[PDB]
Amino acid sequence: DIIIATKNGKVRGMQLTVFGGTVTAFLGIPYAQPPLGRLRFKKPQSLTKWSDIWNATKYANSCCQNIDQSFPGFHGSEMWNPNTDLSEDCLYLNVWIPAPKPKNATVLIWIYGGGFQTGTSSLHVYDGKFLARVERVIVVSMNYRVGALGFLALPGNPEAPGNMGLFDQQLALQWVQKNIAAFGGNPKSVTLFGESAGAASVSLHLLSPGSHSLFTRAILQSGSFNAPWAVTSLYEARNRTLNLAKLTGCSRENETEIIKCLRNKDPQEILLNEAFVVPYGTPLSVNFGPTVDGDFLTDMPDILLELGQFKKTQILVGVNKDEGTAFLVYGAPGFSKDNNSIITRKEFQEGLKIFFPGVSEFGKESILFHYTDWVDDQRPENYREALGDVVGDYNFICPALEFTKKFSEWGNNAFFYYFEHRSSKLPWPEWMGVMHGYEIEFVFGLPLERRDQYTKAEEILSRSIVKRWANFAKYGNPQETQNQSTSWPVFKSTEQKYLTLNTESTRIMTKLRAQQCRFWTSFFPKV
Ligand SMILES: *[C@@H]1O[C@H](CO[C@H]2O[C@@H](C)[C@@H](O)[C@@H](O)[C@@H]2O)[C@@H](O[C@@H]2O[C@H](CO)[C@@H](O)[C@H](O)[C@H]2NC(C)=O)[C@H](O)[C@H]1NC(C)=O
Ligand SMILES: *[C@@H]1O[C@H](CO[C@H]2O[C@@H](C)[C@@H](O)[C@@H](O)[C@@H]2O)[C@@H](O[C@@H]2O[C@H](CO)[C@@H](O)[C@H](O)[C@H]2NC(C)=O)[C@H](O)[C@H]1NC(C)=O
Numbered sequence: 085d086i087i088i089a090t091k092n093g094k095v096r097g098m099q100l101t102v103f104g105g106t107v108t109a110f111l112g113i114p115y116a117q118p119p120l121g122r123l124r125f126k127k128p129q130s131l132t133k134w135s136d137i138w139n140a141t142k143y144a145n146s147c148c149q150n151i152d153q154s155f156p157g158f159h160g161s162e163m164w165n166p167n168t169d170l171s172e173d174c175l176y177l178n179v180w181i182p183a184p185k186p187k188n189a190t191v192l193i194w195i196y197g198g199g200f201q202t203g204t205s206s207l208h209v210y211d212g213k214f215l216a217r218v219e220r221v222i223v224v225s226m227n228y229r230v231g232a233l234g235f236l237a238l239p240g241n242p243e244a245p246g247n248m249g250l251f252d253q254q255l256a257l258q259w260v261q262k263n264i265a266a267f268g269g270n271p272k273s274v275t276l277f278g279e280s281a282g283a284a285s286v287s288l289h290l291l292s293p294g295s296h297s298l299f300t301r302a303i304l305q306s307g308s309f310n311a312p313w314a315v316t317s318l319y320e321a322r323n324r325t326l327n328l329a330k331l332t333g334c335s336r337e338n339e340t341e342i343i344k345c346l347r348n349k350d351p352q353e354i355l356l357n358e359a360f361v362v363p364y365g366t367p368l369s370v371n372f373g374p375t376v377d378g379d380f381l382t383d384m385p386d387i388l389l390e391l392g393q394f395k396k397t398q399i400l401v402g403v404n405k406d407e408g409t410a411f412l413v414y415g416a417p418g419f420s421k422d423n424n425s426i427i428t429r430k431e432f433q434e435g436l437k438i439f440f441p442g443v444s445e446f447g448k449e450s451i452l453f454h455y456t457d458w459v460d461d462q463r464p465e466n467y468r469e470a471l472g473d474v475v476g477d478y479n480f481i482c483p484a485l486e487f488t489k490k491f492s493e494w495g496n497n498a499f500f501y502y503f504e505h506r507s508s509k510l511p512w513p514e515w516m517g518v519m520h521g522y523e524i525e526f527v528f529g530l531p532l533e534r535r536d537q538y539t540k541a542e543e544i545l546s547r548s549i550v551k552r553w554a555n556f557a558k559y560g561n562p563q564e565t566q567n568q569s570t571s572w573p574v575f576k577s578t579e580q581k582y583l584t585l586n587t588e589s590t591r592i593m594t595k596l597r598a599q600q601c602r603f604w605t606s607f608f609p610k611v
């Protein structure tokens with residue numbers, strides 16, 4: 085029986101057997117007042133405090149969110165859907181600690197992705213019990229508000245200031261600072277890690293003055309705030325907020341009246357209108373996201389990054405070989421998870437209209453010119469392959485490389501990886517390759533469970549990743565020092581060395597996607 089005394093009360097956890105050892109789990113500890121009623125759309129309020137023992141013995145509710153219904157019955161998509169009841173009462177976190185209680189362990193805090201519109205900490209691929217068991221770190225993860233309920237913005241108005249879901253994250257980080265020594269953790273050794281929107285979040289915590297002293301280091305998996313989907317301008321934000329008002333019959337003249345109205349709508353009415361606050365969207369739409377609010381974010385973040393105004397510390401950044409393939413079966417003509425999706429020059433053109441709503445015609449011709457100089461066979465899968473690369477390079481890979489260059493130009497060590505292993509258990513078709521999201525299970529150590537039908541080469545790959553991530557968090561250096569592994573060099577502007585992660589041998593390469601990113605990074609933002 086394990087009871088830990090926290091500043092807000094006592095909590096009881098539960099013991100789990102993992103690989104012939106024990107980890108203790110505290111699932112669903114609250115970290116804020118439930119944001120209901122008049123608290124809807126507001127910054128999270130700190131926690132009142134209970135007496136008696138809070139039982140943290142199951143995962144809490146997930147925050148309200150629309151769900152992916154494109155492939156009912158399909159594990160590939162359904163594995164990302166929420167697996168606890170949805171509810172506005174969702175502000176909870178989880179802690180996993182090694183047994184016996186460690187003495188001053190390093191802390192890993194996970195922030196989930198989901199486009200800022202979806203996600204939850206209780207997914208199976210985010211289970212922190214392997215990391216605690218194997219590397220004797222503490223793992224924490226939190227639920228934060230997503231969609232309008234987490235990011236609705238009427239700039240300058242504390243009834244709806246914007247960025248509320250980012251303040252949920254921040255307050256969870258504060259909870260770790262005040263409470264983690266009680267569970268055996270070292271608050272002076274805290275690493276944030278995250279994927280996609282969760283990576284983008286990690287990168288804004290690097291820019292946010294209020295987050296500066298709540299963590300030590302940061303890991304960014306497939307995402308950063310300079311991605312084109314990650315930050316909403318103040319103009320779009322207001323247009324979207326009134327557009328949602330209009331659609332829910334909440335249009336008013338006094339802005340506090342709109343918010344007051346919207347606080348009487350009920351969750352399903354808000355969720356149901358989120359998709360249309362925008363004339364045209366794409367499979368990568370972030371209708372309600374981070375904004376420059378003058379509080380969490382004090383200036384456009386491209387300016388902060390260029391001019392060196394962020395937390396000085398080490399970073400670990402990466403991307404997957406086929407980032408862009410997942411999104412093509414959500415609306416590109418000729419694509420299906422149920423066939424090899426050979427498409428034609430003209431389907432490719434239509435595909436760009438889907439992914440670049442506009443985007444002048446010259447904008448779109450220039451993408452085509454740059455990605456369709458075949459060399460050459462012909463090669464029926466030429467156009468199918470080119471559309472995934474377009475989507476991956478633009479949305480994930482070039483933005484992560486550019487964040488990494490600029491961050492490192494200010495004097496800090498940075499490490500970059502390119503993950504190129506396709507899970508032997510991937511339920512999506514072969515043509516989709518090393519998809520977005522499918523490194524996560526390796527980072528969390530799921531392939532360490534033999535019972536689970538991964539190959540031997542995959543167990544070893546996972547074991548090596550887990551060690552590198554842990555060494556990064558503990559010591560600031562992602563090396564695996566014992567099994568004569570390849571050294572991971574720091575990434576600098578100039579040489580730009582990166583490390584490949586795959587089940588054969590890993591290599592040091594230079595200048596990932598050099599020609600492609602010159603296009604996205606120098607030219608395209610002009611059109
Ligand atoms: C700001 O919003 C307007 C409003 O248009 C929207 O009305 C909302 C309530 C919502 O239902 C949404 O689906 C609808 O489009 C946008 O204006 C629209 O823009 C398109 C393309 O230019 C026009 O064809 C429409 O006529 C026009 N609608 C109206 C009613 O004027 C506008 O684009 C948007 N501006 C942005 C992007 O900030
Ligand atoms: C690969 O499949 C796509 C997807 O559309 C189809 O999915 C199949 C598995 C099957 O159930 C089919 O009936 C379903 O519509 C095909 O794209 C479609 O191609 C058909 C040609 O009949 C068009 O009529 C559809 O408009 C088009 N749909 C979309 C949304 O793209 C595609 O042709 C097929 N390609 C192959 C076999 O290479």
Ligand SMILES: *[C@@H]1O[C@H](CO[C@H]2O[C@@H](C)[C@@H](O)[C@@H](O)[C@@H]2O)[C@@H](O)[C@H](O)[C@H]1NC(C)=O
Pocket residue numbers: 187188270272273300558
């Ligand atoms: C636990 O260690 C504390 C300091 O260790 C951290 O100090 C940071 C500045 C940074 O170097 C981290 O990477 C270090 O790991 C120490 O001050 C505490 O007193 C220790 N607490 C214990 C053991 O009770």
Ligand SMILES: *[C@@H]1O[C@H](CO)[C@@H](O)[C@H](O)[C@H]1NC(C)=O
Pocket residue numbers: 096139
């Ligand atoms: C907390 O959990 C334990 C389960 O054994 C129980 O004994 C205790 O009464 C619980 N309190 C509740 C259910 O609120």
Ligand SMILES: *[C@@H]1O[C@H](CO)[C@@H](O)[C@H](O)[C@H]1NC(C)=O
Pocket residue numbers: 338339340341
């Ligand atoms: C709008 O209504 C709010 C809410 O009662 C009120 O406090 C505010 O003064 C009004 N704003 C103006 C200046 O019209």
Ligand SMILES: *[C@@H]1O[C@H](CO)[C@@H](O)[C@H](O)[C@H]1NC(C)=O
Pocket residue numbers: 547548551564566567
């Ligand atoms: C090192 O290699 C051995 C096999 O010789 C393996 O079992 C062990 O887990 C490896 N350690 C890491 C951190 O990869």
Ligand SMILES: [Cl-]
Pocket residue numbers: none
């Ligand atoms: Cl043509």
Ligand SMILES: [Cl-]
Pocket residue numbers: 568569570589590
């Ligand atoms: Cl190696």
Ligand code: NA
Pocket residue numbers: 450607
């Ligand atoms: Na050009």
